[PDB]
Specification:
The complex is a heteropentamer.
Chain C (H helix, E strand, L loop, with lengths): L3 H15 L6 H14 L19
Chain D lengths: L2 H26 L1 E8 L5 H7 L6 E5 L2 E7 L19 E6 L6 H14 L7 E6 L4 H7 L2 H4 L20 H18 L9 E5 L7 H20 L4
Parallel strand pairs in D: 1-3, 1-4, 4-5, 5-6
Antiparallel strand pairs in D: 2-3
Chain E lengths: L2 E5 L2 E2 L5 E9 L8 E6 L5 E7 L6 E3 L8 E5 L4 E7 L7 E4 L26 E4 L1
Parallel strand pairs in E: 2-10
Antiparallel strand pairs in E: 1-3, 3-8, 4-5, 4-9, 5-6, 7-8, 9-10
The chains are: A mainly alpha, B mainly beta, C mainly alpha, D alpha/beta, E mainly beta.
PDB class: membrane protein
Keywords: GPCR, membrane protein
Assembly: pentameric
Amino acid sequence: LEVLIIVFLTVLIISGNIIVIFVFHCAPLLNHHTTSYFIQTMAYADLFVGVSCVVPSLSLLHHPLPVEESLTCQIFGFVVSVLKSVSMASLACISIDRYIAITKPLTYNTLVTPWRLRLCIFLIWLYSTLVFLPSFFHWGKPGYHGDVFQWCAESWHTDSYFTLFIVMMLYAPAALIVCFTYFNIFRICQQHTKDISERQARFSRYAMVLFRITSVFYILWLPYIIYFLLESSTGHSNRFASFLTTWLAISNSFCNCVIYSLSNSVFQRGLKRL
Amino acid sequence: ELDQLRQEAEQLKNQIRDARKACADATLSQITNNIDPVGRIQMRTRRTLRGHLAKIYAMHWGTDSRLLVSASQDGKLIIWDSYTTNKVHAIPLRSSWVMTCAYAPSGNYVACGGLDNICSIYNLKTREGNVRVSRELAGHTGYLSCCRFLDDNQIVTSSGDTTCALWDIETGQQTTTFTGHTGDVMSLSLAPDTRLFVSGACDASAKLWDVREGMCRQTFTGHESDINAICFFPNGNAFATGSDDATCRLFDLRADQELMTYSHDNIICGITSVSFSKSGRLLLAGYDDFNCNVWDALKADRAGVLAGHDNRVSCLGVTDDGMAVATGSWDSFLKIWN
Amino acid sequence: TASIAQARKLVEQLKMEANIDRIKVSKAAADLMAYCEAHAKEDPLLTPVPASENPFR
Amino acid sequence: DQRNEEKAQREANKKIEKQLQKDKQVYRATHRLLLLGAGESGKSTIVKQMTGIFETKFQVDKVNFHMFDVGAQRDERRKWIQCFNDVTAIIFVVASSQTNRLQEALNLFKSIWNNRWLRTISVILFLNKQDLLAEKVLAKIEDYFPEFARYTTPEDATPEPGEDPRVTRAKYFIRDEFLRISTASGDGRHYCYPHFTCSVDTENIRRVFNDCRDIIQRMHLRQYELL
Amino acid sequence: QVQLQESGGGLVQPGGSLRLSCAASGFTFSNYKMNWVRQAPGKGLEWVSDISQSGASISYTGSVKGRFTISRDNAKNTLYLQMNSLKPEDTAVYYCARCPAPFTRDCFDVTSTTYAYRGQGTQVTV
């Protein structure tokens, strides 16, 4: 079960992010607009998630690290949590960028300049690394990514207050942002389509595009955030559900790849010509 | 008055047509049947020049086969180094609508023109360090389609007022005017000896001029629609054209007629540019369907394809040592092939 | 009747263009083929050159 | 002799690229328009509200606009019309009307709309002389456009106060001629914005601003595959 | 060489009929949309009608719609026009003009002072 799921997900994640990076770099522009910056940043973070999913892949195939098991789980939880938060933050910033491009279409380029993009990316990485830092200090357990190893599954004990801190500072904002921005874009598409139809019908798709963006994210991320809060606050653990929720959230790092790069037509044209 | 004049024009046209007919001894394909075919031609992209913000309209190779100039919609003129991919100069233009650019045979100058009806000449030998307009030649009453230097003081332009001209850049006047066409002139090509040149206009005809006499010599009228590109054979005795009817053709100056036709039933897009190889065995043509085609000039068989652009191919040139082909396109990229 | 000059010019141009000498197409094709076969060895695009002396590889 | 000149090449390239990034920043923040229309249409007064080609600069709410008018060219548009294939919009000015002028206006609109390189450009259409139309109607369209006698004002018409419907029918007839040419093709990839202007008007720039805002919003919606 | 040659015309009584013909040479008649244009005395050229490549789409001016007809024969390489129930104002010189490029739906410069792809015209008088 676990070995097969982990290895399959690792290979898919690495392969998809590698092909995305190389199609971006070794082709015509593919580096043209502003949202491409956050798409590339999210690709890099997902690829590093795939690479960092080699430590449990090796350790489960009875290849224990030269270092202890406690050290491996300590480092693994921190690294994978930080990279997942970077991915989610870039996913929220993509939606903010689209909202600005669609609501302010004539002053879009003045508002979003490359200096601001670089500052945004740097602050994303800084914030993501700095939120989970108190895990090394004696505040609590950051996540359930390290529960495959038989030491961390029973050694760390989550803290309600650290879990609440993580939730309120990273997870809830990144869901409210997505909901707000894509709902407003939905309203604008709905009025423009009505105008077009009433024009065309006088003399003689957007739903399913927004439904793929704003449902994969939630179906993969809300199970994790719910179990996190319940198990932290109460203590009613359940090993049968933690694996599923955590590795669904990890598989989101390939779902992002597919539904943000593969479905684009320009990307397909560039890949078919190369 | 006009009746007998039109009758005499028809009579002379018939006499010329019969004179050419009594000269078609044997078709060029009938002679080059035994010649072994070239075989498949594979070319790979070696460089990619990435600095233009918008469409690319023209380019020209330096006679040293290393540098090249290119023009674009954003209002820039950029000189490249094809070996190392380094930009050398970047000249900003007063008018954003430029349709042509040429690079001097000595390397000291570079020209451009477009929808403002003016040819501007830029002195690259910056004594003080900056590139500035040496001369603005304004005597045309329509946009500029092409321009080609003869030397450091003479330049031939073609325009959208059905007229070509020869300029004295020092005085800025027009030395001679060539007035035969009945449509916009879209291209020109200078002979190897630079005593004659050919033009292509929007009346599906081409003419051969005398630079010193100032008169038309011969007229070639095979095509069906507007001619967009023109180029001499390396010999100087023949030339090739490319028009909007998705076809290329080869004409001969000594036999005064057409020799070959390069078309296929699956090609339905117009040609934007033609060029030859160093020996004259290949003929390269850029199309509106986003890619280039390589032709066997003697047998009219396709030999390859140059598909690396995302938008239409607007220009195409071959170095003077015949070592590379540069291709520009509306997606704002040049690409060197080999 | 400003178009009399147009027809005059057409007549003189055609009349001057009809009195030229023409070479049989066999000779022209032979010359083209001879030029191509005599300069075929000096064409880097036709006979691809090894990468040692290729400046772009 | 080698490394130092390579350093010089790299320095020159870096300086050029810095100037080019500044230029690219300037170039994306400006919107370019092409102003068409025959001589009798009244383009001159429209321009005064704001040599082979002319140019006008104006900004509204701190947004910069270019507008290009063709100067001394010939009457053969099929070649120099391709230079304008990625402008924001085309402003087509028509005068409500010596031969049939409205037929030439409609034919030029039909040619512009269906051209291969102008199939993504939207047209802001100005029907200019609404006072000459007011006098001429109340003093004929059936003899040049024989479908007028079977035309009735649309239900969603907006008549100006103190205006008899006699001119409202003609106004909406001409607008619907242009609009019904517009929708015959285009795959929904571009749109027409018709306005009833006058010889003197203080709000043409506002109309162009709103229309360009809508055009750019729709283009952005369409480039994210949301439309 | 592109050559279009009109025929037909002459003097007819008002209320009468005519039938023009235009024989095309030097290109494939089947790849181009064909036109008819006319020029009244002391005025400019004015578009009259046109027919598509296959012969499906047809358009007319408002003032001639109902009387004139345009038809083409791709096999015989000829373009026609039937001008019945004429009026005195229909006196002009009629040309057959071809669209500049094949496989296209637009035609820019047919009604232009110096166009390169039309004939010399036939005088029709009423």
